[model samples]
Target: MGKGDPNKPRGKMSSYAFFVQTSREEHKKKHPDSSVNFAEFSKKCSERWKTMSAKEKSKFEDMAKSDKARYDREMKN
Candidate 1:
């Protein structure tokens, strides 16, 4: 999904990105079917994501903070 260079550094995942990841997994786990189309699936994620409260979002902000430190340590080459 990287637009340009293969070696390009990807920034940390946003709160929404993290939400999407978890939500996607949960959906797949429960469904594991071939009913809905890709367009329907993608549309609902954004809508539902906006509805989720800030409590879950804080989890990702904390993640991004710690991740920055870990990335800095590992990328020092």
Candidate 2:
């Protein structure tokens, strides 16, 4: 395959994916001096996911929907 384009739209993320993303950002801000390995990172997010309310989870779903909408527009161009 040829080289990939950086500007190309990315695929939509699942609800859980969005949770991991925001969690990482928040984690960084709260503990700026600390950095955990991938295993610990995913482990924390997974546990948090189990405790999150539906209302909170729906926020990520909305993000995924908008992301999908963006992908559709880019493909049409």
Candidate 3:
């Protein structure tokens, strides 16, 4: 299911979970004066996914899985 699609509710937790601290860090690194609005960022990610090619989408999904696993491991302290 696509992001924020009400018709296809996967679960409470996201498969591609984004931690706020990481997002803010990245945003600050990229745009020193800019602030991150998570709602807007989520919308942008959903829009980009909707327009991406199947191959690209698959690649992203795979990467998301790997990233999630890595994040989980790191946070297990």
Best by TM-score: 2
**Superior by TM-score: candidate 2 or candidate 3:** 2
Higher-ranked by TM-score: 1 or 2? 2
Per-candidate TM-score against the hidden true structure? 0.58, 0.68, 0.44
Q: Which stretches of candidate 1 lie over 4 Å from their true place?
A: 1-8, 35-39, 74-77
Residue 42 of model 2 has an lDDT of: 83
Q: Where does the lowest 10-residue lDDT sum fall in candidate 3? A: 9-18
Native-to-model Cα distance after best TM-score fit, residue 23 in candidate 2, in Å: 0.9
What are the lDDT figures for the candidates, one per model?
A: 0.65, 0.76, 0.55
Question: Residues 3-75, candidate 2, lDDT per residue (tens digit)?
Answer: 3558764555577878777787778767878877667798988887889898888898888887767766766
Q: Which is superior by lDDT, 1 or 3?
A: 1
Candidate 3 C-alpha lDDT tens digits along 4-51: 655643323332343333344567667876655877576666666567
Model 3 local distance difference test score: 0.55
Instruction: Indicate the residue-level lDDT of 4 in model 3.
Output: 64
TM-score of 3: 0.44
lDDT value for model 1:
0.65
Total colliding residue pairs, candidate 3:
0
Task: Kindly report which residue stretches of model 2 are placed more than 4 angstroms away from their true locations once superposed.
Answer: 1-9
Cα distance off (Å), candidate 3, residue 14:
6.3
Error of 3 at 17 (Å): 4.0
